[PDB]
Amino acid sequence: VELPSLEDLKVQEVKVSSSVLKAAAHHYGAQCDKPNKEFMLCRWEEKDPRRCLE
Amino acid sequence: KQDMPPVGGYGPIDYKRNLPRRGLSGYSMFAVGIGALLFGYWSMMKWNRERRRLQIEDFEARIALMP
Numbered sequence: 107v108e109l110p111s112l113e114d115l116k117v118q119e120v121k122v123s124s125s126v127l128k129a130a131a132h133h134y135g136a137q138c139d140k141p142n143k144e145f146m147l148c149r150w151e152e153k154d155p156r157r158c159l160e
Numbered sequence: 161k162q163d164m165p166p167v168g169g170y171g172p173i174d175y176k177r178n179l180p181r182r183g184l185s186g187y188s189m190f191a192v193g194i195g196a197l198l199f200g201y202w203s204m205m206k207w208n209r210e211r212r213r214l215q216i217e218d219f220e221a222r223i224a225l226m227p
Contacts, residue, residue, distance in 0.1 A: 128221055135224030142227035 114159055 120127075135142065148158040 127225070131221045132224055135227075145227050
């Protein structure tokens with residue numbers, strides 16, 4: 107197998123806790139809806155999460 | 161001439177036998193029982209049904225995250 111580099115990692119990581127992530131959490135998902143629902147098709151409809159990194 | 165029995169002052173006490181106090185019987189009971197029990201299940205379906213609504217909200221916060 108072949109893997110992507112150490113680059114295309116180390117992105118700006120959301121460093122929050124569990125409750126403050128679950129704090130808003132409800133207003134969150136129901137109003138972005140372009141990158142995330144399409145990301146599910148990038149994971150369900152085609153597998154191998156090594157292709158799907160954008 | 162100093163002997164016992166009095167000229168008067170007596171009872172007597174009874175030989176009888178009685179304490180039949182009723183008692184709320186005979187279709188009065190089996191009516192307070194069912195009337196209490198149906199108040200219980202009526203106090204259900206307002207809590208167990210309502211907790212199932214908050215249950216779905218608890219799963220809701222899970223699903224709006226995890227992409």
